[PDB]
Every structure is written in structure tokens, then in C-alpha cells.
Amino acid sequence: SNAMPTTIEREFEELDTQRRWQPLYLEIRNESHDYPHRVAKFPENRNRNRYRDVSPYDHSRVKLQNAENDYINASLVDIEEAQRSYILTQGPLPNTCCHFWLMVWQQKTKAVVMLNRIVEKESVKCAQYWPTDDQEMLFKETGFSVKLLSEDVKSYYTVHLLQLENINSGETRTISHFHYTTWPDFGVPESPASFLNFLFKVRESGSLNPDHGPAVIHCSAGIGRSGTFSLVDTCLVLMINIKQVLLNMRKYRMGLIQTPDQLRFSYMAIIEGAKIQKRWKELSKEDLSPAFD
């Protein structure tokens, strides 16, 4: 243990007392690398993109193997230095839920992390791409079905245990679907504890470990909340220059972290995380029935 505050804690104190979060965010925007995204912008892919100005780079886009059109709005975010990769994607469209599950199958993904609500400020942000009851959800276009096996309902998140079936091979895989239900669009989690309680629930499943394909992280556009989650997880693993880590992650997917408050939150979560999981759990008020047996 060091008495000297970390480079990160030093930065946080300056930025807070000098009120420089908006200017730092501006620097990150202007210093962000630009790469081609021609495939995203082929006319035949228009109905595969939720938003006109969030596209994957050609160099890091996830390809749908063996399909007439291999395009999905999804990016492989690779941080070798941390032995972490993630796929960050948009909320699937009604027409791209089939592509989403084909991607999950092909990439050997074990966890989906969903950070958005289906409807936010009266706008549909995501299709209902997993079941809400005991009914089998069929994706005929790609030959997958999804069953809800069980769910763990907490006060601000739900863990859905899903069975994904490749209906052609008959093979199945159980997928952990971690749904954060109280993280507002263009907003931040209620507290560092609430976010860290969630991230460590994901970690404690094994789904982020290298024996599995990359976890699929999404929100609405797959950059704001998804970028916050990935930035915090990547920095905790590396524990560092957070500004440089974010600019490197942005080389793989445009626009990660969408607000100055998301950047400040990322700092606070990393400083809380870098240190207790029982304190996070109680402070998160995750339990709907906290009564002792």
C-alpha cells in the first residue's frame, strides 16, 4: 500500500476543484481517431443501423460468418494489455435480433450485458430479443431459439438465464443476460457501489474470463453506457492513464462515453473499485426481500 495518491486520484481532485470535466471531455472528442466505416454505410445496411451517426469501423466490426450480408452494428473492442475483449453493439432492431443471436453463437459469447431499458423517454431503444415468459422465442432468419430458464430479479437489475439453441445443429448454450434496468439514457448509475455491485456480479459468473468468447455489451447505441461499463472494467483489470485508455478503446468503436458526467462517473467507479463487495451489495439495496429467513 502507498500513501502517495494514485495518478488517477490526483487527476480526479484537480478536475473536481478546477471544474475541468467538460473541457477534458472536449479534449477526448478532438483527440479521438477517425477510421473508415464504409460497410456500415452501404445502402443495403441502412435498416441494420439503429442510428445514422453510430457505426462500427470497418477494421474492428464483427462479421456474421457464412451469411449473404455479413454486416451487424457491432465492434470488437480488444485491450490485449488487459487480456480483455468485448463486443459492443446497439440495441437489436426487430429485423436484427436474428443477427444478434447468430453473432452470440459464432463468437462463443457466454454473457450479454444490457444497460438500457426497452423504451427510454417514450423512444423504443431495443427490441425484446429474449423471452419474458416460458414461451420459446424463435429467430427463423438465422435458425436460433431462446428460452428463459430462470431469472434473478434485484431492485435495479435482473439476471436472466437463457438457453440459446442452434436449431440446425441441435446444440445449446446457456447465456447469462445481465440487465441493468435503472441506468438512464445519457445518465450515470445511482452510485459507484450500484455499478460495482453489478460489474462484480458479471465478473463472478466467469463470463469476462478468456476461456469464453467476448461478452456482448449493449445499450441503446452501444457507446455511452456500454463504453462506461467497458472503460471501468478495463481500467480495474489494468490496476494508469484513463484518458489514454479511453482514446485507445475508441480506436475500436467511435464515441465511447457520451457525456462529461459519464467520464467523471468512470473515474469515481475506478477509484472505488481499485480498493468491500458486501458494502456495495448493501449500499446498492439490490435485495427485494432483505428479510433474514
Swiss-Prot record:
Phosphotyrosine, modified sites: 25, 71
Any single GO CC term annotated in Swiss-Prot or TrEMBL for this entry: cytoplasm
Positions bearing S-nitrosocysteine: 219
Effect of mutating residue 225 to M: Impairs phosphatase activity
Gene Ontology terms for molecular function: integrin binding; non-membrane spanning protein tyrosine phosphatase activity; protein kinase binding; protein tyrosine phosphatase activity; receptor tyrosine kinase binding; STAT family protein binding; syntaxin binding
Domain of life: Eukaryota
Induction: Up-regulated by IL4/interleukin-4 (at protein level).
Active site residues of this protein: 219
Domain Tyrosine-protein phosphatase: 8-273
The EC number(s) this enzyme carries: 3.1.3.48
Result, substituting residue 185 to A: Substrate-trapping mutant; catalytically inactive it forms a stable complex with physiological substrates including INSR and EGFR. Accumulates in the cytoplasm upon stimulation by insulin or EGF; isoform 2
GO biological process: B cell differentiation; erythrocyte differentiation; glucose homeostasis; insulin receptor recycling; insulin receptor signaling pathway; negative regulation of cell population proliferation; negative regulation of chemotaxis; negative regulation of epidermal growth factor receptor signaling pathway
Tissue and organ distribution: Ubiquitously expressed. Isoform 2 is probably the major isoform. Isoform 1 is expressed in T-cells and in placenta.
Residues that coordinate or bind substrate: 185, 219-225, 258
Positions bearing Phosphoserine: 55, 284, 289
Top EC class for this record: hydrolase
Catalysed conversion reaction: O-phospho-L-tyrosyl-[protein] + H2O = L-tyrosyl-[protein] + phosphate
Subunit architecture: Interacts with RMDN3. Isoform 1 interacts with TMED9. Isoform 1 interacts with STX17; dephosphorylates STX17. Interacts with ITGA1 (via cytoplasmic domain); activates the phosphatase activity towards EGFR. Interacts with TRAF2; probably involved in tumor necrosis factor-mediated signaling. Interacts with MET. Interacts with FAM220A and STAT3; interaction with FAM220A promotes interaction of PTPN2 with transcriptional activator STAT3, leading to dephosphorylation of STAT3 by PTPN2 and negative regulation of STAT3 transcriptional activator activity.
Family per similarity comment: Belongs to the protein-tyrosine phosphatase family. Non-receptor class 1 subfamily.
Protein name (database record): Tyrosine-protein phosphatase non-receptor type 2
Residues of the full protein shown: 1 to 302 of 415
